[PDB]
């Protein structure tokens, strides 16, 4: 199965045409993009406070070598 990512025909009824004219002149879809970055401004950042905080690791981590004893 396949799908088309970009094969759609815009409608030509006066309401749709005006909706697009308002988009072109009032920058509505650019304003919308500003909303997304604004929402991120008020999200808690993902930063950890290295070296006081450390990224998570697992027992399998492969780091510095060492020779062991019985």
Partner 1 sequence: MWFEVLPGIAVMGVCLFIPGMATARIHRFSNGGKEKRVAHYPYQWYLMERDRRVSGVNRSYVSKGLENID
Partner 2 sequence: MFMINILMLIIPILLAVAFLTLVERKVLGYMQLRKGPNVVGPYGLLQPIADAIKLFIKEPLRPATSSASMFILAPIMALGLALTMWIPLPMPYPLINMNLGVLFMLAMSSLAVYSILWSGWASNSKYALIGALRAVAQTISYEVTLAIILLSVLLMSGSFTLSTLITTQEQMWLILPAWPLAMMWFISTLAETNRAPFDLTEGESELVSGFNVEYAAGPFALFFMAEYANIIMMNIFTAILFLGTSHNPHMPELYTINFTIKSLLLTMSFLWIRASYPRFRYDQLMHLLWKNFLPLTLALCMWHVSLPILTSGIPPQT
Partner 3 sequence: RGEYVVAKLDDLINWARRSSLWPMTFGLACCAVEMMHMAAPRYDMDRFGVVFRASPRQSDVMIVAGTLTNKMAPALRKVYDQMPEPRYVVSMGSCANGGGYYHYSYSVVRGCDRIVPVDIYVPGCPPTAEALLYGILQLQKKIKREKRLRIWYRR
Ligand X SMILES: CCCCCCCCCCCCCCCCCC(=O)OC[C@H](COP(=O)(O)OCCN)OC(=O)CCCCCCCCCCCCCCCCC
By CB under 8 A, how many residues form the interface with partner 1? 4
34: enclosing H helix or E strand? helix 28-41
Taking the complex as a whole, the smallest distance from the CB of residue 6 to ligand X amounts, in Å, to 18
The C-alpha atoms of residue 23 and residue 16 are separated, in whole angstroms, by: 10
In the complex, minimum distance from the CB of residue 31 to partner 2, in angstroms, rounded to a whole number: 10
Sign of CA dihedral 6, 8, 12, 15: negative
Binder to partner 1 among 9, 12, 15, 42 (CB under 8 A)? 42
| Contact between 11 and ligand X per CB under 6 A | no
Check residue 37 for interaction with ligand X (CB under 6 A).
no
> What counts of helices (H) and strands (E) characterise the chain?
2, 0
Closest separation in Å from C-beta 42 to partner 1: 6
């Amino acid at each position: 199965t396949y799908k088309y990512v970009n094969l759609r025909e815009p409608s030509m009824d006066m309401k749709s045409v005006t909706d697009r004219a308002a988009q072109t002149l009032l920058w509505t879809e650019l304003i919308r993009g500003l909303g997304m970055t604004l929402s991120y401004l008020f999200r808690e950042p993902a930063t950890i406070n290295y070296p006081f905080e450390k990224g998570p690791l697992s027992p399998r981590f492969r780091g510095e070598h060492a020779l062991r004893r019985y």
